[PDB]
């Protein structure tokens, strides 16, 4: 009975720790997946805008080199 009494409290601690653990890890997982996603969205937006600057360079070099 005493050894069983220690197994039960050890289990209660184990599972409480497990919840705290997997919540901690699940959270860090999401925050890191999110930051990579948000940054990937903004990186693509800026890379489409920098692709316009580089098309404006072609149109400004078609007036200067067609005269």
């Amino acid at each position: 009975k005493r050894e069983h009494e220690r197994e039960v409290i050890q289990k209660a601690i184990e599972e409480n720790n497990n919840f705290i653990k997997m919540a901690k890890e699940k959270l860090a997982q999401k925050m890191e997946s999110n930051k990579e996603n948000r940054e990937a969205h903004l990186a693509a937006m800026l890379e489409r805008l920098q692709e316009k600057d580089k098309h404006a360079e072609e149109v400004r070099k078609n007036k200067e080199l067609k005269e």
Partner: protein
């Protein structure tokens, strides 16, 4: 000890904290500046009201609470309002930019900038506590801060405070006062990510409260001030078991043992009576039988559903004021023979009763009548799943076309989260159906 820390998130959370804390101050005779004449023990004490209020050496009684919002306008009105002296400036926390009705910004983008500061301040209150019982989290389902910051906070609180109990008072969105088209998305995302971390959740349906204000208080077009004053009364009835001494006072956790038969089934339906205007309450004393009967009228409920077309798993009555057990028992006997109350076959059908002697109070210049007695029923009925269903249908209409989904994906979320959350609510709806099916 048995201290309880309140956390008020976003506009709805904040403005309901005002209503609540204004009300608690009147309930305990605490003046605006924080002084309490009737408290002879200066600097501290063990009294029942100390579960919600710490004392300073100067005699100031200070709410065990934290207001958090990602923009300053709502909290600035607490900083300059009637009760500005009640709160330590570090309890009132703001950012510069809001979540903009977007769960994602509240949870990730704007939210992670202020979250360590919020936990740091929650920690400072937690260390004034000799035996902390748990948190009470006030927030809207529909807001960006209310939905996404709360979810982040709840997750983080489960890490810092383990299994320490967490109660939610959640504002459920209604078209009469709704501010955003995307509220159903925010609602289903917060509900999903909060469900493992909350121990009990009292939903308040803005429509239900809106209807009660029009019908019972004769208010033509209720504002938030009108709704919060009614809500604070309900909140007060529920927390009154924590804040008052009493021979017949059953503690709120004891009700929770009865209210939550499985971890996911933790959404009690509340119903409050009497809500009546002064005009109508004059020469009209409402007995224990009348207010008890009013608890089973579904127009008095906090969530629009029909318990009559569902099954009960528990029924708690929290009376306050001039009430004695005899009258309560007679009243319950009458109701059992004359009303539609069917329990599931695995619950005992006894109603659990608690009584506080302190009668309810009213905020000066309000619409409620001061009454000698009052009652809040907390039931666990399968009917409340109706509320999930309505909201889940609105979510499905938009999600099928991907309306607005780009605003969430741009702030970093994936489509996976949306469908993962919706399937969790699909399962939850299926759980509330299963518990009602009879055994074999």
């Amino acid at each position: 000890m048995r201290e309880c820390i309140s956390i008020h998130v976003g506009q709805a959370g904040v403005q309901i904290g005002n209503a609540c804390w204004e009300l608690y101050c009147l309930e305990h005779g605490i003046q605006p500046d924080g002084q309490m004449p009737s408290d002879k023990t200066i600097g501290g004490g063990d009294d029942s009201f100390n579960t919600f209020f710490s004392e300073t050496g100067a005699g100031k009684h200070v709410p065990r609470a934290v207001f958090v919002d990602l923009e300053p306008t709502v909290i600035d009105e607490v900083r300059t309002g009637t009760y500005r002296q009640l709160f330590h400036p570090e309890q009132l926390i703001t950012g510069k930019e809001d979540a903009a009705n977007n769960y994602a910004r509240g949870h990730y983008t704007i939210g992670k900038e202020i979250i360590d500061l919020v936990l740091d301040r929650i920690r400072k209150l937690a260390d004034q506590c000799t035996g902390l019982q748990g948190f009470l989290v006030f927030h809207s389902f529909g807001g960006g801060t209310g939905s996404g910051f709360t979810s982040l906070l709840m997750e983080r609180l489960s890490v810092d405070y383990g299994k320490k109990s967490k109660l939610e008072f959640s504002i459920y969105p209604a078209p009469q006062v709704s501010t955003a088209v995307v509220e159903p998305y925010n609602s289903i995302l917060t509900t999903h990510t909060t469900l493992e971390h909350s121990d009990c959740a009292f939903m308040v349906d803005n429509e239900a409260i809106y209807d009660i204000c029009r019908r019972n208080l004769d208010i033509e077009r209720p504002t938030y001030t009108n709704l919060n004053r009614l809500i604070s009364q309900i909140v007060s009835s529920i927390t009154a078991s924590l804040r008052f001494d009493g021979a017949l006072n059953v503690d709120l956790t004891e009700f929770q043992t009865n209210l939550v038969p499985y971890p996911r089934i933790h959404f009690p339906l509340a119903t409050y009576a009497p809500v009546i205007s002064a005009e109508k309450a004059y020469h009209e004393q409402l007995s224990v039988a009348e207010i008890t009967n009013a608890c089973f009228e579904p127009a008095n409920q906090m969530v629009k559903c029909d318990p009559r077309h569902g099954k009960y798993m528990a029924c708690c009555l929290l009376y306050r004021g001039d009430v004695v057990p005899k009258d309560v028992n007679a009243a319950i006997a009458t109701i059992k023979t004359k009303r539609s109350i069917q329990f599931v076959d695995w619950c005992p059908t006894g109603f659990k009763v608690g009584i506080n002697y302190q009668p309810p109070t009213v905020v000066p210049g309000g619409d409620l009548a001061k009454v000698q007695r009052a009652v809040c029923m907390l039931s666990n009925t399968t009917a409340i799943a109706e509320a999930w269903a309505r909201l889940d249908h609105k979510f499905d209409l938009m999600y099928a076309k991907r309306a607005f989904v780009h605003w969430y994906v741009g702030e970093g979320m994936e489509e996976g989260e949306f469908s993962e959350a919706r399937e969790d609510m699909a399962a939850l709806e299926k759980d509330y159906e299963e518990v009602g099916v009879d055994s074999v």
